[PDB]
Amino acid sequence: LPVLLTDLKIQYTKIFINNEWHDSVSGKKFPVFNPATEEELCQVEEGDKEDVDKAVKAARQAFQIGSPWRTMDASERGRLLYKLADLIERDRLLLATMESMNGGKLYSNAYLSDLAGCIKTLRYCAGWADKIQGRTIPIDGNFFTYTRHEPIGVCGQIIPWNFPLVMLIWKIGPALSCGNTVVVKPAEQTPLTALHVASLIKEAGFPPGVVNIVPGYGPTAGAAISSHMDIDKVAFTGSTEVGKLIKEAAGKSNLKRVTLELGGKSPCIVLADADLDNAVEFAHHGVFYHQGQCCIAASRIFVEESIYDEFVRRSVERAKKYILGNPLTPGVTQGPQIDKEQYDKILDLIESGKKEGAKLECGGGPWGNKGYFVQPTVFSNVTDEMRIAKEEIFGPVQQIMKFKSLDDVIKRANNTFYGLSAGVFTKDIDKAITISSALQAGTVWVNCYGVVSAQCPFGGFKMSGNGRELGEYGFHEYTEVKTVTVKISQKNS
Amino acid sequence: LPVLLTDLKIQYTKIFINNEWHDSVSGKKFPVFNPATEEELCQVEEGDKEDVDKAVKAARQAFQIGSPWRTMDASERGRLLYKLADLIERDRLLLATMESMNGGKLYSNAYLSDLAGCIKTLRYCAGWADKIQGRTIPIDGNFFTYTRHEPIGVCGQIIPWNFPLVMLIWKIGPALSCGNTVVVKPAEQTPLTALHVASLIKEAGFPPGVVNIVPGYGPTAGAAISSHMDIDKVAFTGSTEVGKLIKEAAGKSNLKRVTLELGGKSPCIVLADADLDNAVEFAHHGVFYHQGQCCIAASRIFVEESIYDEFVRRSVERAKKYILGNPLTPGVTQGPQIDKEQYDKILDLIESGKKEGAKLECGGGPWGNKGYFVQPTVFSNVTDEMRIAKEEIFGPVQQIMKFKSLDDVIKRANNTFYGLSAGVFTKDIDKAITISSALQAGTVWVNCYGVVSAQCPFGGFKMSGNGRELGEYGFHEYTEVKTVTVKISQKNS
Amino acid sequence: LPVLLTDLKIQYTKIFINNEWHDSVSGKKFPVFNPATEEELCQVEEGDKEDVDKAVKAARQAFQIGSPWRTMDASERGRLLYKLADLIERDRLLLATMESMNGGKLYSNAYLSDLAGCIKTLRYCAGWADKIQGRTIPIDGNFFTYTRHEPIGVCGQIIPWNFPLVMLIWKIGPALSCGNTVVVKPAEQTPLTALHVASLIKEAGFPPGVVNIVPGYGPTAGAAISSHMDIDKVAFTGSTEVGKLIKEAAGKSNLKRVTLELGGKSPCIVLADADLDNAVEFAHHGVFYHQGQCCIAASRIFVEESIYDEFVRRSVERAKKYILGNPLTPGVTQGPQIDKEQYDKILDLIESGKKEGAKLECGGGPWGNKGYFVQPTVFSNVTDEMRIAKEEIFGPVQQIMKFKSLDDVIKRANNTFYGLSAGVFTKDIDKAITISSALQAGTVWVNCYGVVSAQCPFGGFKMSGNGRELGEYGFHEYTEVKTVTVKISQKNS
Amino acid sequence: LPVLLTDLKIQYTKIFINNEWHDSVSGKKFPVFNPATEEELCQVEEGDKEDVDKAVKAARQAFQIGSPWRTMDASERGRLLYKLADLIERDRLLLATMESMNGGKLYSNAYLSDLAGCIKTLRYCAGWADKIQGRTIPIDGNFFTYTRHEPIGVCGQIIPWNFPLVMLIWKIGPALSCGNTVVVKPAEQTPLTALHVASLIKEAGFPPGVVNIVPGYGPTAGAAISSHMDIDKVAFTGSTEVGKLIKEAAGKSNLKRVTLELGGKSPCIVLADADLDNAVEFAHHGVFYHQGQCCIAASRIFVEESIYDEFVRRSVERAKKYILGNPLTPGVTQGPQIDKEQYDKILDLIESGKKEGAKLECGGGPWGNKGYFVQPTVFSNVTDEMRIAKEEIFGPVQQIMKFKSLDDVIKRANNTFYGLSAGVFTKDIDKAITISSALQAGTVWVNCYGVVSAQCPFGGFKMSGNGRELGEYGFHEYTEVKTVTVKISQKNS
Ligand SMILES: NC(=O)C1=CN([C@@H]2O[C@H](COP(=O)(O)OP(=O)(O)OC[C@H]3O[C@@H](n4cnc5c(N)ncnc54)[C@H](O)[C@@H]3O)[C@@H](O)[C@H]2O)C=CC1
Ligand SMILES: CCOC(=O)CSc1nc2c(sc3ccccc32)c(=O)n1CCCN1CCCC1
Ligand SMILES: [Cl-]
Numbered sequence A, B, C, D: 001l002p003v004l005l006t007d008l009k010i011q012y013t014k015i016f017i018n019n020e021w022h023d024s025v026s027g028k029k030f031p032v033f034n035p036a037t038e039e040e041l042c043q044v045e046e047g048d049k050e051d052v053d054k055a056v057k058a059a060r061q062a063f064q065i066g067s068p069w070r071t072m073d074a075s076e077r078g079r080l081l082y083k084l085a086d087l088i089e090r091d092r093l094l095l096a097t098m099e100s101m102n103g104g105k106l107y108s109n110a111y112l113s114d115l116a117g118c119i120k121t122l123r124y125c126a127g128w129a130d131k132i133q134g135r136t137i138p139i140d141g142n143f144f145t146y147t148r149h150e151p152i153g154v155c156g157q158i159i160p161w162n163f164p165l166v167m168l169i170w171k172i173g174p175a176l177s178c179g180n181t182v183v184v185k186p187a188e189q190t191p192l193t194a195l196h197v198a199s200l201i202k203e204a205g206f207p208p209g210v211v212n213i214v215p216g217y218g219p220t221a222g223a224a225i226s227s228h229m230d231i232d233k234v235a236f237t238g239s240t241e242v243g244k245l246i247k248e249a250a251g252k253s254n255l256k257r258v259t260l261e262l263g264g265k266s267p268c269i270v271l272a273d274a275d276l277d278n279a280v281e282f283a284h285h286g287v288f289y290h291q292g293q294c295c296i297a298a299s300r301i302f303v304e305e306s307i308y309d310e311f312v313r314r315s316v317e318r319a320k321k322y323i324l325g326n327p328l329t330p331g332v333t334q335g336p337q338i339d340k341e342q343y344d345k346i347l348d349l350i351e352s353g354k355k356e357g358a359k360l361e362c363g364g365g366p367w368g369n370k371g372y373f374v375q376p377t378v379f380s381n382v383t384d385e386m387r388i389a390k391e392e393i394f395g396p397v398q399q400i401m402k403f404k405s406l407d408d409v410i411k412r413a414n415n416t417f418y419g420l421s422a423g424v425f426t427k428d429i430d431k432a433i434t435i436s437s438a439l440q441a442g443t444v445w446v447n448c449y450g451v452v453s454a455q456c457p458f459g460g461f462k463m464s465g466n467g468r469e470l471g472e473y474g475f476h477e478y479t480e481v482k483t484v485t486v487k488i489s490q491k492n493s
């Protein structure tokens, strides 16, 4: 685990449009904080509607028929993405450090996981660019018919603060591989890594206007994207509330394409025949990863009665082993929550668990004199009507419940408006296949949890979102299909 | 062209839920009219929110894990669809007659085209059922990963009055082939053919609740579908206004998947080297088909100056050759518009063309003492800011314009919030390919127009809709992708 | 289980070329026998080189650019195949009876399985016809590139006597769906069902020359196919010896495409945790089905030592329960072998098992005064160097062996030049996945055996064959891919 | 056009097995010559059967279940290929020089085209590695069925001398991306660039035994590959004669999979409406490229009578403009033929053209005192029965013919046992589509020629070969499909 042997210096703080750095139209700036210390790191240019309009015009122009980005070989779009991955690999120490400092994110994970994921995802996407293909189709009648899987056009992409870099790359990788242009709005909490990447987009040689990055707030810059009359598509990861607003704003304006990923209340089902240590470990990391701030957090763990008490005991032992503190310091194993709102939400929900009669096994309160820290918290004997069993907490708060009827537990697992993911732990082939088939969730892990890769599509059932990202299947959502049908004198098979 | 040698008798007038005929919960009924005579044909049970709730419950139950429709072989879903096609072929005379009588639709077209399209589309969809496949994916790490392309669940499907049968089958064919269950709301104007088909769904042996048909109005039954908390997806063909309302209602409620097809203002570009007679014929039929009531109507025809006057002359000669009257009577070549609202809209727009200075070549007024008839109408020297050049008329009203700059005409062709289709007429390979690539439209025809087939995906760019129907690509929109990732001791390629 | 309530009368005994019945050029005929009685059923026209030349010319002409079969809609090729399935369904009683009488095949299986498989396979193939698609490809440079998945042309198809109808349809279904024309040579033992199907091909309305059926012998009619200078592809199921000759003859002549399926020595691995009754049943039916005359026969069954004796006991009990006799008589559960050569081969191999020291548990000799009957025979304590462990027997002869090292048994399972299929019986997810991945076989069944369907590709690893039949993947082998690359002035994504 | 600013020094002259350099078992070496000077460049270790056996054992071991190459992530196979491309880019000057010196290949083409093609092809193949996917399949009955697209195993790959590097990469890129191991036999004429690449395979970090390179002769090392009992597949580009021998040897031994590309007699059809200068240029380069030593050489050019004389005149003017000499010297535009056999064959065929009455427009004899040089030669009024119209010349010899019947010229174009490629020159859409559809050739170029890219599949119809290389479609030929079918208690769609 190498580190930056020199203190981080913040350089890139401006709006990125047509490969140059812009002041906000208003002249306004907003502060950016270190969640572990509550101290301002810097000021960043505050994008708003006016700045979004500049970025959209730039993106529109870069998408015009005859432009460099429309006319270059697909393989060259791919080359540019591979180059960007190489640049991020070059600046890995710097990026992992900035990510950890701005995002409250453990540095070892930032370096070994987030940065690795960004690099691998970009390289995966680079490979698709010249492998996006349409069809030739044996239509009835004397016609030649083919399809073009064109890029859609200008894609507005709004990303959250929990995985700033990974989410940036998850959005831009596919969009660019397919030939789109993008207007990106990073989370107000975490604009800095996106702006560094923008410098590397310029360095790699992407044509101007192909990627534009507009830091700013949700109701301002975000809303301007969702309601813009010349944005063809909007992609978003974040809260359900905002997802609704985005879909509504898209409907009112220009009926732009919308894809959403909106978190979850993801269940695990642990059968009595399960490898118990393996289930405890994966379910543990499954809920606690990055201070509980994962859309896929395994926030309801149902365990067969006969192994329930043992499951709970071992889970508690594991949760009691964390070291809280600054995510930069080696050996520290839990960083802060991102901000006050999240902090407040986690505490309120923890209090509801105590009130509504859940058994507190450990944690249950805040930690320290600075930083938005929350003790890792475990509740057992949780019941389905409790707030901590229904609401996404997005904090280090684990719920453990028992069942003895498998039919009943699948119904309980499914009894939510969410549906992002689930986990099944068993040694039995038939149970693994039939349970995974019955769960209304986008990804089901069997005898593991939290395994996400560029090669697999990822997305929600129900209110956890719509559409899929990554894999072969995800690329479909960044193309617009055109059918071309040509009259011919006579066809032959 | 065979005919029913016995008078049509209306039998099926009720709400279809769980394969039985239901009265409306309210007890209310609404009238159904023959647009050619303005006479009531019958009364039909009026579905509203309460009836939609009954259909959704039925559809939900038919979709449950372990149900007949979830557990039957995919090939058997396909068999059921093939059987339904055979039944519609059996009742072709009856259906074509009912379609023509209720829809104001020329009987020869109803029989030879609409009914043929329904049959062929169903058979096409039947073939996909056991050919819907997921993937196995060489994910990083020691895992086995596969995907399931599951049906989504309960699909709400709202269809228009212009092609009642074709649109019914365009919706239910793919949805059912993929294993979904459906709640269908036919247009208030044209419920009758859908209800006959429902009798044939029962006869074919589809499990109850797999298809439910709820006749009724837009703001009542339609709105209940779009806002329902247990409908997983809504599909819609109709007006832009309603498309917006549907997307908004889906966002406010349960973030259900939405696909829309919303008509157009589709352009043709006729180059000087074009086969002129061929371009005139296809552009003519392209705008005039079914009294102009096609989403893809070729409602802006741009012709190179040197052949413009000849194009206009020949177009006028062709338009002056129609025989208006009852769509049932042989040799009649133009039926009525569907209803008063459409009628009023076409007349108002025709008047705006005269006012704003378009040259009237023929038609321009109503026809007859009964029926919503409009003279076939041609305007030349139309300019881009005129109402008849911007608004979808949905009537027998042709606009012809000239150009001499090809760069300019492509920009004019593209200068619309619509984008459903377009036509290009030229003998030159390079022009055909480059022009079709540059047009922002879902289907581009070359040296033809209006060629739609079950084998090709169909849908809009921009505000003409989102998603694609039919072809291989259309089937994707009726599946929900689940990734299953299984921990293994060691993988091997 | 319905039966023909009228005695079978043989009608179709001639060579089928251009949809008419032909005498052999030589005037020669050959006899056809009932294997259960050794009595001649009829005489059939003997095709030889001269007749093959007539069929190839007919097939070539039907494949010419501009012909009905090249110009008809793909959906119409599909319609024709669906019609043929409907006709075979109509004549199911007759076909199942003829199959059983000519092939020595149990009538209940013939009716319920073989005929069902033919019908289902044809319907599956019908569905692909208009779903065979090429690609459009974003090649480097200013070009438009697309591919056509054309039919190959004249396909020579040689099929065996064990599943005459199923194999006929397995060959012609895909070939025709893809638009090829075919020259079929049924086994000399079993020409009759193929000739009836030919009458139904004529009745369904296939254009003449699209299917031609040339009964005759291997070294005569078969060899003429394999060496023909105007046959584009040859497909074959049968013996390894002949497979070699076919590949060699194809290399010497016109380098025609070759696909082979050549039987096996397929292993099962039964782990100690397996559902034992389920493993015994499937392994039993897996080797004994159709008198052992299946390419996929489970002819080496390795059982973990701790359950080996119990496995063997239960296997023996099951084998001792058969009733031998005429395949037409209800309750009869084992018919004859096909002919004297097979009969002789099975007996010789059974004798080698006794000689080389295998433990005879039951059977071991012939049965009856007429018909090529062999007692169902079980050997335990078989070792890998014995003839019955290495050679495909193609008779009712089961080999059971023990193991205790899993690494070792996989190596033993794989230690063969064959590789058609295998079976794995265990309750453990990891073992099921890792073992199936390690076995060098085309199809691996888990906790079942002998499950073959039109939707899955089927074919061998190693010397069990090359290429795959059926599924999506099998269709690729009946197309020839053409790339078309068109110079354009400027491309756009 | 940069050059090596230092003289080339030959380093790598040994057999490459398990990532180390081996002497031949016999101790024998063979000489390697510069075709431009007829001087020996070096000696290279001569591989024979014994050495092939060592390489196959190494390849077999590297392919074993549990090996590094079988267990590494697919994305890592891709990474290794990307690294190799980067290494070849690093050594581009050296490789382009060695290629030109050993292969008689113009240095500017070697550098700008061959080396670029190698790099781009490797990068294309790298991108597929983790995008090779099987299927999940909705089989009839209560089963879970999926497929694995496994690597085949040990692939023997025999390549020719005309494009040593490009062909090496065309073979190993796909084979390795798919996870195979390879035993490569470069042409005896041109082993040197392959051995340098082998050093870069070692440097990139490929596991030992994954690639093995065995220089040597055809009937010795080549024959040992084709007849080997433990090689799973053989791929070959070269002469028809050898293709036959390979297919036969594969049939006699172990029925290994075979794919062949075998050159052609590729036709162009130039219509009267064609852009004439464009057709002349592409047809010219189409036959003359790399001294006529391209499988796709446009060796029959049919021109409509009305433009035939002009076509011939302009073609002659272009052919008379070459500068012969050393392929290393700037401004030199034609190098030597590869060796004496080719040289002799070209001269003999040129003499047959004079004898049989073809009109000699220019060239017709040898050139210089050393090097296998042949004057660029044009024949007009060539007729279909002449040797130069039927036999692949593989020299700088152009045939031009006239036609006036389009039906007739397509039949003439098709009247060959070859079918690798063809060209069509016209401005008319319908002709371009219908002619290209009618030509029995693997690639058809329209208004261009010789446009080959990694993204498109490439291969012959008829005796020009079997199978396809590159594109998505080519990758299929380097996988072996396994179906896995698992019994489950109950399936759900
Ligand atoms: N799916 C996921 O991974 C995430 C889920 N969440 C959930 O949402 C809850 C609230 O967290 P927030 O930070 O408020 O998430 P949020 O959904 O409001 O913020 C995420 C992104 O949306 C933008 N945004 C906010 N308001 C917007 C608007 N009106 N229009 C357009 N864009 C807008 C933000 O600026 C940011 O870029 C969390 O407690 C958690 O449960 C939060 C972040 C990520
Ligand atoms: C290859 C893409 O990059 C990464 O995987 C970075 S890490 C990571 N990304 C995402 C999630 S949700 C999600 C949704 C979309 C895209 C990426 C992710 C997550 O939860 N994580 C931590 C897993 C730690 N795990 C602990 C045990 C196994 C992995
Ligand atoms: Cl498509």
Ligand SMILES: [Cl-]
Pocket (backbone or CB within 6 Å): A457, A471, A472, A473, B134, B135, B147, B481
């Ligand atoms: Cl998928």
Ligand SMILES: [Cl-]
Pocket (backbone or CB within 6 Å): C134, C135, C147, C481, D457, D471, D472, D473
């Ligand atoms: Cl292809």
